[PDB]
Design a protein around this ligand. Structure first.
Ligand code: NAD
Ligand code: NAD
Ligand code: IPM
Ligand code: IPM
Ligand code: K
Ligand code: K
Ligand code: K
Ligand code: K
Ligand code: MN
Ligand code: MN
Lengths: 350, 350
């Protein structure tokens, strides 16, 4: 069995999630996976129907599933709502309630696809980075937070156990990869960066088989574009991970490519890094690669189906060469691009 | 009368500041500018002699000067000091004591120098971006702040007047440029981002001749590398401006290139974006472009010598064509590169 709660959300979310469901249904028919999914209202779609972005039946669906496949939430229609019911607060709540503290956001340039990057070929060649972002703490969830007429405030707060457990994930990921971690902070200005750095250094002592370096967040952002092949695992807190991972999209060449997994105590969540892209929603052009590769991360991390996840990545890469979507300089919209993916997947099987 | 307080600082700070001084001296001799400068201890060097990074004689010099030419502060020698007296806190105290709230950090790709970027030529071509970063508020200065054994906290916060005065600077800069402002925040997750967005939008109603757009900081980091030519003025808070301005160095191709001005109520300060670069300090290689162009920004913003600022910018461009430094793939050390800038300046003098 493979029990999946599907949260398509808003804007391009449903468009890309549908493309990802087509790939999963195809795998399920080919492989006998026992795929069982149900679609649940989430974000702005949930607000329009229930008045809150993460309503009861959706919380229940998440809770009872083995994995969540998520699209994206948000858009101009919901601009101005009180924060406690905004579409993005629904995704914060989902993460927090499942204690999904480890956000894995990989960025790789597939051999032969260096041409898709805005970076010169020789700079993009061989890039394979993994961002391990702390997802349930920091300024996203810190108290106090608020606003008056005169001012507004938010609190970047981390405890020792929160830093420890995300650091452990990064070192364990680096063990499985190329044995390098760079930890990222603003320790020269912020108490919380200092605390972060010391704690990651403490956890590092238990992994003498892994190399540990530290970088200030400003320099890291530069180094990640100028010398990306240098980095293996990058560990950082909630807001800096959010920023470095959208930035990491310029390595393979588009934010339409980047998948993610959110792992922790509860039901794991797999979603594109990208948002709901209201500028192109409803035009049938959204690149579904990030949703499709998030379904591949789900197969690997939630279901242990490592080889199927790899066939999906391979058919995506082929489709990227054959029929690029518009965000990568081609003209294949969502359904045509997914169709190319499905033909490569059928060619690899049938 | 051109009274300048010079704060060389630590690591490559004195190296590149000396080169900027050679350029200012050649201008003073050729133009009779009444240049009168004095060199003051600052950062780590001030800590070792006086016990604090912004000591009394340097405070007095800054106060009595019409402008500050500042190098860089910091390095492993001062790691572990109480925060109150860290080299970087000396730079925070300089900014705050002079109420320099507007940090101007420009990034341009000069025509014919696109090949210096790690981005493909067609992407770097025509780039001309000005980041206007709020410099005296936000998480850098927010209270409460602290660290125990169990946790650490910092407060990101902004008042209405602090947002307003930096937004006004951004719109007034846009009016002199291409009349486009993008304001950058994280309003979908942070109260402070929403307060920022609302306030910039309110200020923008006075400037309806300026297009105003808003981007979340993660999507902005991505857009700045993929589509840099689309941006004119970018306004943002303290930490986001820190990050995006290091990232902006990949457009012309090196952090060794980017100058900045800090403007407000008190004595304006001009310094490179880059740090003290302890990994190359004392090797005679540091690119002095950023310091030299910071002296140009000083001539423009503090002294109204716009024509002389442009001549310096033109001699720097030609030096980068003829004898690039090692951070840009060439072999000219700091002194050799400066000598090329001086040769071009002396030709322009004719
Ligand atoms: N996980 C999420 O639900 C998530 C993440 C980020 C943003 N958001 C929400 O998304 C909305 C848009 O915000 P944004 O513009 O900053 O982020 P965005 O990630 O939605 O879009 C960023 C840029 O990339 C383009 N883009 C993104 N995904 C793409 C795809 N698959 N194909 C082609 N182009 C793509 C968009 O058109 C836009 O130009 C906002 O409401 C934001 O709050 C949601
Ligand atoms: N304005 C300031 O005084 C300032 C700004 C940033 C960092 N710092 C401090 O500087 C020190 C180093 O921090 P960092 O490594 O993150 O930042 P950095 O900006 O000093 O160096 C970042 C990278 O760019 C290279 N680089 C920087 N300037 C260069 C130049 N002019 N020419 C050639 N290469 C150059 C460096 O060697 C290094 O690889 C720390 O003590 C940090 O706190 C100070
Ligand atoms: C929807 C929002 C909370 C989110 C985040 O900032 O985590 C978005 O950029 C993302 O990257 O998921
Ligand atoms: C010295 C430090 C406070 C500084 C900053 O973050 O402002 C550094 O990155 C810089 O960019 O000046
Ligand atoms: K998403
Ligand atoms: K479950
Ligand atoms: K500096
Ligand atoms: K003064
Ligand atoms: Mn994001
Ligand atoms: Mn910086």
């Amino acid at each position: 069995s493979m029990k999946v709660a599907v949260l398509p959300g808003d804007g391009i979310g449903p468009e890309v999630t549908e493309a990802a469901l087509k790939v999963l249904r195809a795998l399920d028919e080919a492989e006998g996976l026992g795929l069982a999914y149900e679609v649940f209202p989430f974000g702005g779609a949930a607000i329009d129907a229930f008045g809150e972005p993460f309503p009861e039946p959706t919380r229940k669906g998440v809770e009872e599933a083995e994995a969540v496949l998520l699209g994206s939430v948000g858009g101009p229609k919901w601009d101005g709502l009180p924060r406690k019911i905004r579409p993005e607060t629904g995704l914060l709540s989902l993460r927090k309630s499942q204690d999904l503290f480890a956000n894995l956001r990989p960025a790789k340039v597939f051999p032969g696809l260096e041409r898709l990057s805005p970076l010169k070929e020789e700079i993009a060649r061989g890039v394979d980075v993994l961002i391990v972002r702390e997802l349930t703490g920091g300024i996203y969830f810190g108290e106090p937070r608020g606003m008056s007429e005169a001012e507004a405030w938010n609190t970047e707060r981390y405890s020792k156990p929160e830093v420890e457990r995300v650091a452990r994930v990064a070192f364990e990921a680096a063990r499985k990869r190329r044995k390098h971690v760079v930890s990222v902070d603003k320790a020269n200005v912020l108490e919380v960066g200092e605390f972060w750095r010391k704690t990651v250094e403490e956890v590092g002592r238990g992994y003498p088989d892994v190399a540990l370096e530290h970088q200030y967040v400003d320099a890291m952002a530069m180094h990640l574009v100028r010398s990306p092949a240098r980095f293996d695992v990058v560990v950082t807190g909630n807001i800096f991970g959010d920023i470095l991972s959208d930035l990491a999209s310029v390595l393979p060449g588009s934010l339409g490519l980047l998948p993610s997994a959110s792992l922790g105590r509860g039901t794991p969540v797999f979603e594109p890094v990208h948002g709901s892209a209201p500028d192109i929603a409803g035009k049938g052009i959204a690149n579904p690669t990030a949703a499709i590769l998030s379904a591949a991360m789900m197969l690997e991390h939630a279901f242990g189906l490592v080889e199927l996840a790899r066939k999906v990545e391979d058919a995506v890469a082929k489709a990227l060469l054959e029929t690029p979507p518009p965000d990568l300089g081609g003209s294949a919209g969502t359904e045509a691009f997914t169709a190319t993916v499905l033909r490569h997947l059928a060619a690899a099987a049938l």
